[PDB]
Amino acid sequence: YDIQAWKKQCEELLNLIFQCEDSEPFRQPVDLLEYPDYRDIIDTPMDFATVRETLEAGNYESPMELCKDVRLIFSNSKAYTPSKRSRIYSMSLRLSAFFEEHISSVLSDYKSALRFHKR
Numbered sequence: 104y105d106i107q108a109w110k111k112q113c114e115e116l117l118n119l120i121f122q123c124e125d126s127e128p129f130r131q132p133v134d135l136l137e138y139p140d141y142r143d144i145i146d147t148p149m150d151f152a153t154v155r156e157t158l159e160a161g162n163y164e165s166p167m168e169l170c171k172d173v174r175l176i177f178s179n180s181k182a183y184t185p186s187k188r189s190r191i192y193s194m195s196l197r198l199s200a201f202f203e204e205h206i207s208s209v210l211s212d213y214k215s216a217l218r219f220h221k222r
């Protein structure tokens with residue numbers, strides 16, 4: 104029933120994601136010299152350094168907000184990919200599966216703790 108536990112749990116999950124080779128394309132923003140049309144396709148860029156920095160600045164109120172930004176990293180990859188078999192998109196799918204598998208208990212525990220708090 105710890106309402107604040109999600110933050111350290113998210114920090115540790117972000118640490119695991121940064122150790123994963125599949126996250127390399129998603130750690131920093133996309134360079135426009137390499138992908139000139141990126142902002143024509145993607146209106147809201149997002150990356151794992153921005154998520155980690157937002158978390159560490161105390162700018163997420165809940166793990167649901169963090170989850171929305173992480174999911175935006177993956178939807179941006181799906182929207183930008185020219186093919187469903189591309190290397191970078193295929194890395195996003197594995198990383199998304201890993202993230203969803205680990206974030207599930209973080210979300211469940213937070214929502215349960217909040218319900219207990221408001222009982």
Ligand SMILES: NC(=O)N1CCN(C(=O)c2ccco2)CC1
Nearest residue numbers: 128133134180183184189191192
């Ligand atoms: N850091 C980068 O330069 N990226 C390249 C564009 N991105 C993609 O999701 C993507 C899908 C298919 C090909 O690239 C984000 C990562």
